[PDB]
Design a protein around this nucleic acid. Sequence first.
RNA 1: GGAUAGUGGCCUACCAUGGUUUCAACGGGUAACGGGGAAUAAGGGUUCGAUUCCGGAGAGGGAGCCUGAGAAACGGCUACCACAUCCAAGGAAGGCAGCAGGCGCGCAAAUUACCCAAUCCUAAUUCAGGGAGGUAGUGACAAUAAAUAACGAUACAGGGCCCAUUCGGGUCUUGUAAUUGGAAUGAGUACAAUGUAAAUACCUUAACGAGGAACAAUUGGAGGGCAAGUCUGGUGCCAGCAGCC
Lengths: 166, 55, 184, 134, 144
Amino acid sequence: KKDDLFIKAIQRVVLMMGRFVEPIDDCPAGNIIGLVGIDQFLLKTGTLTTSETAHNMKFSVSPVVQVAVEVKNANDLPKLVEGLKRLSKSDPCVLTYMSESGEHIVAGTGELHLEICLQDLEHDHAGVPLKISPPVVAYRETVESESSQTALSKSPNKHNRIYLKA
Amino acid sequence: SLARAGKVKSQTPKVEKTEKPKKPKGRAYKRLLYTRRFVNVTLVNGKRRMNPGPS
Amino acid sequence: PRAPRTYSKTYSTPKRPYESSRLDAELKLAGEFGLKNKKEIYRISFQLSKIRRAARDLLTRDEKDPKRLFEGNALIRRLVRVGVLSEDKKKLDYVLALKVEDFLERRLQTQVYKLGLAKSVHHARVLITQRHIAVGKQIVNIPSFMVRLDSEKHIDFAPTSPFGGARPGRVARRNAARKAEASG
Amino acid sequence: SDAVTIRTRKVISNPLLARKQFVVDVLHPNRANVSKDELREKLAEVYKAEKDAVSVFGFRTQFGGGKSVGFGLVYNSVAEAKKFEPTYRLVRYGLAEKVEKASRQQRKQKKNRDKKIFGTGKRLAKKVARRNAD
Amino acid sequence: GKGKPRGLNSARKLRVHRRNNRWAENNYKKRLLGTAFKSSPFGGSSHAKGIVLEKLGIESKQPNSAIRKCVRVQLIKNGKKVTAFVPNDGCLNFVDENDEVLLAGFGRKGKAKGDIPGVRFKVVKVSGVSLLALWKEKKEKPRS
RNA sequence: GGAUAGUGGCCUACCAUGGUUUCAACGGGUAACGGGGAAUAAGGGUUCGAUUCCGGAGAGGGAGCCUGAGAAACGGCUACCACAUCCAAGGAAGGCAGCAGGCGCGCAAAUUACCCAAUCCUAAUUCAGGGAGGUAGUGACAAUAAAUAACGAUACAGGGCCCAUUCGGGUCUUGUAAUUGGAAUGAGUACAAUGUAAAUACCUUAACGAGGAACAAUUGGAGGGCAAGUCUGGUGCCAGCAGCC
């Protein structure tokens, strides 16, 4: 069954030389190479086969710091969404997601991630000014006694009486 | 109160579809129309009614 | 660079499509002669529209005009060739009196019924779309064949079909195989 | 194979290049179609030219089967066919061999590579080779 | 007689008189003056995308006592405040905030649709997901 | 008199004060390249026409120039303007409104595929080259045709008419069936053949391919215009419906 499979054809294979990419006709059954034309949509690193079945092939310090990002410019929602999507594309270990805030909280294994995505969201795919926010929190409530005093309810219809304990 | 968006939509009861073999379509649909409207004389009483309620 | 390919619609919806005076009579026609859709019948109305318009501006002028006599003589030859026009009326007046049926009973969907080989207009469709009738020497698949008054002398069953020989049948052979396997 | 009854139509001869052009109609009841291999030499015994000197192309099948119409062409002699018939059809018949070649881009990439280099490059080759050596 | 001249060589007189008369059409006038281009917030466009900023609770006219749950949407190319109306029930929460909705007309060609004033356009798509298909539970709207 | 290949205020020195204009000059806007045409309709007419054909303008905005018969050429250069690549910090290399493909933009628009086999063009020329072009891929922009189903036998209900032997048969019918039966090809499979530069497409045809639980056809409405409920359950000026009332 097709889970995340696509049948796009190879555009061109290349061999990079210090960002001076030169064209390559074909490549052997080994050695690392550069490839373009079939990335397009991507979520995480994977592999590629040709046969029907074609059976084929964790890091230290998990992301810890969560920081919300809000763009200063008003008309930036499509721009912000595109920027975060291609940031996730370019970051193989990031785990950003909307969370409760819904502002696509930025994750990272240490504050060096915050430092690098500073200049990233400043002069990269986003290319827009923005400010940071304190990390989101999630605090619940509970009870620890047995309702020493009874409860009551009031309404315009005063005949409704409720007596409950917690 | 804007929170009442589709208020009655939520209060409506849950009714599911009933099993029914598919009605033939194409020239059979035109055939099905003829065999029950013109040649059929079941409903020709006063106005040639074709969706009457329970009377 | 390419030469554009000419195309033209062969149907036209009426100005009033929402009224009960015409749908009932139209429902009768589709059921009587067994037509799946009704885009075909507005096409027939389009067929009558062009000849009526061609006839309308033909009689606007006087007689003995060389183009008028050619167009009149050429036209009446077509209708008598297909058969929608009788063989004893060539006064350029009956070419305006055609009604919707006259261009519709000439359809191959009804010719086989008139020959008694279908027993119903809908069963005739069961002989047409499944290539079980050969209006000419070669098998056809078009219900709207527009016979030209000479197919009746040439009509015959399809060669590669039952009642025409050369084969017993497809599912008939399959049923025989099942019977032979069950018997053994 | 049931009553093939091969038959030609509109046969005209032109000694300009020694060929006979005609359109052939074949009716084959109880048969799906006729392949090219046996379709070629059935004209050999009716025209006495040669089995492989004949040439046939097209043969569009009419709707419903049992009849094929297309263009057929017979040749005076084999030796004429080599330098008259285009080589793109001898590969279909097997008389000639299709020249092995890559796609059209490889020739374009090669052509501009020689275009950007002036001369044979034989003198430039070792001078660059020595320059990279030291 | 009968007003307009009927002279053989008078053609230019009633030709220009025709031009001034057809100047009074609602169709002729705004077609050339570009009111749909310089004043309308669509720029001659059948549909346009926008960003919802906040919601509105505008009431209706007599004799209806109801609110249509209108929303405020800002365009991109033009950039002026524009009101929008939620078409169907329960879609207000799907157009709550920060949704890349698309605007569409009402069929009135530049006036109020019904009993809800201050509104002239409606929304049919949200972030590439149509509202009617979601109302039929055919597709899903991405949260972000 | 100069320059042009040519006539000409094209330009030059002199002379005259003139030329057009309410018969719409001149200036402004054009979501203005023009035409051949397209949509719409008895007629008249209105709108559109960048878009396959013809004639014009452009290669980011101008200006200048050689070669060349033919250029103010930009897939030829020179300088500026605003972008913009490589720097081993001296310098050098460029203008996709050419074929694909990318970004920003937008309601809005496809593949960085194969071939000169076709219709031609170019050169020294039959042979070579051409993202001119053709083929294929996406594609519900628009056009044509056309699947999703029919036919027998039993149980009811009928119309002429035969006996007038009682309300008995009903011999020919047309429909409803918690009735059953055979024949029938198509979509999808494709052995094979034709097709095509090789294929992928069409038709033919070994063979596999319905009994509905199946091989499942939807978009809207049912107060009026606008034909389609005084049917059932839920909400009760609230949700809402509604292009109009």
